[PDB]
């Protein structure tokens, strides 16, 4: 794949061609869009050192994340008391999730599913509960409904994946499973990622409700009554919401990536905990605080990084580049050129 400059004559016949990448004179010809070059110095292209090799540096962690307990639990929590589990200090292989079942929902916000294995996360959190199938739509940012309003609210700027699958086999009983509860009455809508387990009677009316359970006085929690016979919309669905923080930091959770050796003073492609770039890594005198894992310049570009294995500060410098100018006496005079 090459760029050519073709001279079509009066009859449409290509009578000559210039290979733009052959030599500096042809590059000048292509930049000037002419087969003749006058005397002068012409800016043609940009010199750039290309990366010799690719380096990957990921934390020296091998133990897999406890996704098995999160997804293969015998009984999930109720939506009003949704369970939050901390996923940290482990390799997170998201490929195991796909194989389990034909998921009803594996919808990701702020990320793509296929790239989850290529990223590092500061502290993953899995929120698990059981809802009705028709309520599965309410598990999303900026949604309206009983589950979203009074049980589990996702933030508008939510970064993470919601995974919902049918649990009719494990959560439906012929007589009816009343274990799972949802909050139906609350004074105000829950703020995102907040749990209300209070069982105080809801006072819709003016008259007090001290357990009276009368009109306008109701117990906030209500049962689900899952049964196998009911349709898919009424069948129970198990939902796990994975919430992770993508802005780079000391990353406890990382994907299954095999780290290469750290090579300095050479222009290399580099991947530090999901941060990908091209540059020369060199020893740095910058002193990083323990929470600080990388440094940014005035353009919010990473100019210093901390090695996940050795905890060594490395300056990142762009690989050498510049402009290329072709000094030519003129194609009439000679085909010799000089390169600046």
């Amino acid at each position, epitope marked *: 794949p090459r760029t050519f400059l073709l001279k079509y004559n009066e009859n449409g016949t290509i009578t000559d061609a210039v290979d733009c990448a052959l030599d500096p004179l042809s590059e000048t010809k292509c930049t000037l869009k002419s087969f003749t070059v006058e005397k002068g110095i012409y800016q043609t292209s940009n010199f750039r050192v290309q990366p010799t090799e690719s380096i990957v540096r990921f934390p020296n962690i091998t133990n897999l994340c406890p996704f098995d307990e999160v997804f293969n639990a015998t009984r999930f929590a109720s939506v009003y008391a949704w369970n939050r589990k901390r996923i940290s200090n482990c390799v997170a292989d998201y490929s195991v999730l796909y194989n389990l079942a034909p998921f009803f929902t594996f919808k990701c916000y702020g990320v793509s599913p296929t790239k989850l294995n290529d990223l590092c996360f500061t502290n993953v959190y899995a929120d698990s509960f059981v809802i009705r199938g028709d309520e599965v739509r309410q598990i999303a940012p900026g949604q309206t409904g009983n589950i979203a309003d009074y049980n589990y609210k996702l933030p508008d700027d939510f970064t993470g994946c919601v995974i919902a699958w049918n649990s009719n086999k494990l959560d439906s009983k012929v007589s009816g499973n009343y274990n799972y509860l949802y909050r139906l009455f609350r004074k105000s809508n829950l703020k995102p990622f907040e749990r209300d387990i209070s069982t105080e009677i809801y006072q819709a009316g003016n008259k007090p409700c001290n357990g009276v359970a009368g009109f306008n006085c109701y117990f906030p929690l209500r049962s689900y009554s899952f049964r196998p*016979t009911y349709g898919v919309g009424h069948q129970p669905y198990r939902v796990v919401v994975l919430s992770f923080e993508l802005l780079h930091a000391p990353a406890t959770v990382c994907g299954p990536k095999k780290s290469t050796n750290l090579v300095k003073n050479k222009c290399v492609n580099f991947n530090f905990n999901g941060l990908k770039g091209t540059g020369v890594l060199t020893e740095s005198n910058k002193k990083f605080l323990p929470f600080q894992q990388f440094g940014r310049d005035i353009a919010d570009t990473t100019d210093a990084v901390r090695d996940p294995q050795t905890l060594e500060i490395l300056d990142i410098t762009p690989c050498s580049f510049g402009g290329v100018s072709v000094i030519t006496p003129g194609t009439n005079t000679s085909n010799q050129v000089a390169v600046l």
Partner: antibody
Framework: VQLVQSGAEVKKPGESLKISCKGS?????????IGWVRQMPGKGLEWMGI????????RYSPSFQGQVTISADKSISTAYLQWSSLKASDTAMYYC?????????????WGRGTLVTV | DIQMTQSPSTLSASVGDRVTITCRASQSISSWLAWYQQKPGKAPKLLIY???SLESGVPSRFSGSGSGTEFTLTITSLQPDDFATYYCQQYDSFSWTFGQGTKLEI
């Protein structure tokens, strides 16, 4: 193409009453709406409710809603009319009825009947 | 809840006569009335659906007509088995309602 209902039975007030209707002679039994109609002694028919056996969806008349519970066991092609708190007003003879699909919502098939006297 | 009034409540006609029964609707239904034969101690059997077409196994003597609020059921020539209760029910909208019923005597 018949609907066989449970035998007529007599029960005292306050007891749980279950009436069974099994459909035979037609295929795709789960895809036919099956309902119950009440006839009081010396009174006209009153439609009570219908169920879709495949998905167990239930529709009820406003008068009988909550008072009755109508269920469908699709596995054995059966529909059950369940009454709680039997009372004197709960004395009538009940028909299991079948609905055609689409926009035809008459009762093409009627069961023999199930008298219940309290 | 569409209300159906069936007139007359009881009718007596000699065998072989032509008998007419009127079913009146609280609100108009677009030809969604069904006519049933209920003999004493028996299951109502569908005669007429859509108020025009008749069910299989029903002789041509039984007939139906009408539209909107007013519908009619007519027997041209009576038979001994013909005399029994007759019902009209709308199926235009849910919460289906039956007529009171007409008892036929010789």
């Amino acid at each position: 193409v018949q609907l066989v209902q449970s035998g007529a039975e007599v029960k005292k007030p306050g007891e749980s009453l279950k009436i069974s209707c099994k459909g035979s002679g037609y295929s795709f039994t789960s895809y036919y709406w099956i309902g119950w109609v009440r006839q009081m002694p010396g009174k006209g028919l009153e439609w009570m409710g219908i169920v879709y056996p495949d998905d167990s969806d239930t529709r009820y008349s406003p008068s009988f809603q909550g008072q009755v519970t109508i269920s469908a066991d699709k596995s054995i092609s059966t529909a059950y009319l369940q009454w709680s708190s039997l009372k004197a007003s709960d004395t009538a003879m009940y028909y299991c009825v079948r609905h055609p699909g689409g926009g035809d919502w008459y009762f093409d098939l009627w069961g023999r009947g199930t008298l219940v006297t309290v | 809840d569409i209300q159906m009034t069936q007139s007359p409540s009881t009718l007596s006609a000699s065998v072989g006569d032509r008998v007419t029964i009127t079913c009146r609707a609280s609100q108009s239904i677009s030809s969604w009335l069904a006519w049933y034969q209920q003999k004493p101690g028996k299951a109502p059997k569908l005669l007429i659906y859509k108020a025009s077409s008749l069910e299989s196994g029903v002789p041509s003597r039984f007939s139906g007509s009408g539209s909107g609020t007013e519908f009619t059921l007519t027997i041209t020539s009576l038979q001994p088995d013909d005399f029994a209760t007759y019902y009209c029910q709308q199926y235009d909208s849910f919460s289906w309602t039956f007529g009171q019923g007409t008892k036929l005597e010789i």
